Amino acid sequence: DIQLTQSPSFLSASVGDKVTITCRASQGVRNELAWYQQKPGKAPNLLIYYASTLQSGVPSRFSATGSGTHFTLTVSSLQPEDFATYFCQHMSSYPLTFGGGTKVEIK
Amino acid sequence: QKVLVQSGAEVKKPGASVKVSCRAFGYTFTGNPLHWVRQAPGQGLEWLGWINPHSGDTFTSQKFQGRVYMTRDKSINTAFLDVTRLTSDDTGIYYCARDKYYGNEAVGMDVWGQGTSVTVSS
């Protein structure tokens, strides 16, 4: 399968600070990437598709950039309800696999 | 308006068969494909596969072929996932998700069901 690795696994930050989370893919995907957010014991929600486009209704503070193997998700200004498990998932070839899981925690 | 609703939680013995339903509201059922994914307790999301409600074509992950089946009924706008030979490793929340599917190819899962909890124990 295609391996998706994430950095950092855990992260402590304050409201108003900036968070940058990196997804790295063993194989090359041009823009076949999706960023999701899942809260504790709740269904996941889509944040980014095509690695650079916000999902409708997503706050504009979110942003993402990257092509090939290196991708970054940026939260410009942390918000109180933005603490959740962040996922990055590829769809270039079967099967579709999700990232390890990045958890943002308040400081 | 786009919503997906599943059946209730299931508790089964090992080796049985479980049927998870998923009905769509607010959008054309045949107009998008449906992913079937699962999340184990405290683990990540495992991609079981996805089905095309219009043509009826299905794709299952290579580590699930011959074990999990998918079907749909357009008359009631529902998609069924049938998982057989249940084991203790199959416990978790099954999710049915609508893909954005712009350009007749996978783009992203934007609408998700409430999640059906399936448990397997002796």
Add this chain to the structure above:
Amino acid sequence: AVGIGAVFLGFLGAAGSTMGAASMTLTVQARNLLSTVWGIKQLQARVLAVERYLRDQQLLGIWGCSGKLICCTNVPWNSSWSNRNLSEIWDNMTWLQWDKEISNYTQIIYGLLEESQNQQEKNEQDLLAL
């Protein structure tokens, strides 16, 4: 990415899609055009629908585009009708906006197609005479 084939969006589901995508569902809209106070609210409406469909079919037929959903013609696109390039037409605009834009030049284009079809028929008759 990965795909599993085409999907069905409904009767007018492709209304909001681009012209390139909307042209892949022409038949979907095409086949739905034909089908004592309430009973007489049906007869004349059915007649009107039949007349509208037959007017459209005759209009297509007198251009040489009979029995076709996409039809090329010998009438050049006079740029005065529209100055947009194809790149911004077929990939960044829908058919409703196009109908809004070109509502003024419809009948002259229709007459041009009619006369071009008549010329084509006469030319074919002349050619087959030899």
Add this chain to the structure above:
Amino acid sequence: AENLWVTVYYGVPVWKDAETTLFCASDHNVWATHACVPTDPNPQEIHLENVTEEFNMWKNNMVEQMHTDIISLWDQSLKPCVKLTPLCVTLQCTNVTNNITDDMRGELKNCSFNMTTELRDKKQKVYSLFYRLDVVQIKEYRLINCNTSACTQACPKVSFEPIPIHYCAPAGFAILKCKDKKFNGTGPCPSVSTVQCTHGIKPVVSTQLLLNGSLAEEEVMIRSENITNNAKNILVQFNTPVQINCTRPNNNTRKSIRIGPGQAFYATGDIIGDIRQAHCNVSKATWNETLGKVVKQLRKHFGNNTIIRFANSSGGDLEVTTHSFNCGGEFFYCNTSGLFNSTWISNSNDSITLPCRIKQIINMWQRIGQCMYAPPIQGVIRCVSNITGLILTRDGGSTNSTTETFRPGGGDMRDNWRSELYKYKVVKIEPLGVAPTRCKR
């Protein structure tokens, strides 16, 4: 260096605003569903993505078509019934005074009169209990409609209960539905769908209170063609229905008098037991909280510090000045004075009782010279309904004062249909189009 050519596309998804004749669909009654297409068991709604459509409830032709259809069905249902031309005679009327309450003083007239029989050369002396609103003194009285037109008795086997009706468009036409919640009936709707026909709309005839209608799924909705214009009726749609219990408790007796060959007139013989006023009950706390919601929604349009007052209807016919409706064949006109009587300043189990007067001679639509006589209903009658909206009218409008007064309104039933068809429009598909392409024939 373009070398572009015309290319004809047939089947293009493009539509234009159009007016056409929608036909009825539904799953003895006045609303003739026996001439309606069967409704599909699983109606299909096509959800149009990226489509934004201009809607206007106050210029919808669907309302006019529904008005015409309802009037036509009402006229058709009454054609085969008995015409009470002989009923126009001198009436010897006395006061019904046995077991009557202080609120029924002279409300019922015991009227004796001569009448025709099946034999042309014979007459029968009969009597009936009429209502004070239905007779006018010439001890000698005559029916109110006698100097305007002869009244047609309603066929007793036909039921007045509303049945849902769907309005499906013909071929080549589509019905666009606005799914946008919080939509106020005018402007761009970005959430649009295509439907073969609407939800089942019940033709409920009511004044000053919309009954058995649809409810707003988000909050109370205020709609007006021009809110700043006091002459325009304000349509209020509730989200929580207000239960109203309306009863006539008189144990009426129906007798039949043969007025001709195969012609029967249904008279009110005698009331078994006590005689007391018909009335309606509305929960007081529910009405208070509904009025609070209406006030807080109206403050958005008329300012945050304005005083919002609810008062009585200004005046006019009994149809408009009172909540007029039908409850199991009998026509109620209820004095809605306990409802719209309050002032609101920005900062248990009892119920409001609305007295009601029953009428048999009815002018349903605003038509002079076409009246209907409702036969009496055998026994006590009760009906429970949902108040789902209001038809208000703003009083005055001068800038001198900071107080706004809203009074109940109605009369024109087009507003009643408009509250249900506000989220619908009809369009005609234009499948032909011409586009530029490099292709050449």
Add this chain to the structure above:
Amino acid sequence: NPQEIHLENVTEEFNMWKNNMVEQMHTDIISLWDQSLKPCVKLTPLCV
């Protein structure tokens, strides 16, 4: 000269007791009987 086309090698299922032609003829006959009597005199005075 009405034309009858004789179908060879054709066997068809017939049922006289479920024929809609009978119902249509019944309706047409009743309608014609009603129509013929509409522009006639009504003997309402005769009830004496």
